[PDB]
């Protein structure tokens, strides 16, 4: 949840951009991102023409994190800065996602 107010402000944000995803519900900054549908709403609610939904659906998990971190550094400029394996196979690091995450939410 929310203990900094850098978490509470990031994690209410993220859970109003992903509001309409069914199947989605963020609930922190570890957890909830290792499968990769989270960056991926992020991103999509933001520009819905940009990729398909059900094709994020199908992919795995590493694939959707990579997927996720090369639409936002095609289309947002946004340096990679974690791994999609940092994710994916292990608990993240929860300062790595928020570090990521603000760079989401200044150019969006």
């Known amino acids: 949840l929310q203990q900094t107010n850098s978490e509470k402000i990031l994690l209410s944000w993220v859970r109003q951009t992903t509001r309409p995803y069914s199947q989605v519900n ?6 909830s991102w290792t499968d990769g549908l989270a960056f991926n709403a992020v991103l999509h ?28 550094q095609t289309y947002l400029g946004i340096e990679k800065l974690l791994d ?21 939410f200044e150019v969006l």
């Open 45 to 72: 609610r933001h520009k819905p023409d940009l990729f398909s939904w059900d094709k994020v659906v199908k992919m795995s998990p590493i694939e959707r994190l990579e997927h996720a971190f090369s639409k936002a």
């Open 26 to 31: 963020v609930l922190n900054f570890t957890t």
């Open 84 to 104: 999609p394996e940092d994710v994916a196979v292990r608990l993240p690091d929860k300062k790595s996602i928020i570090m990521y995450l603000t760079s989401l």
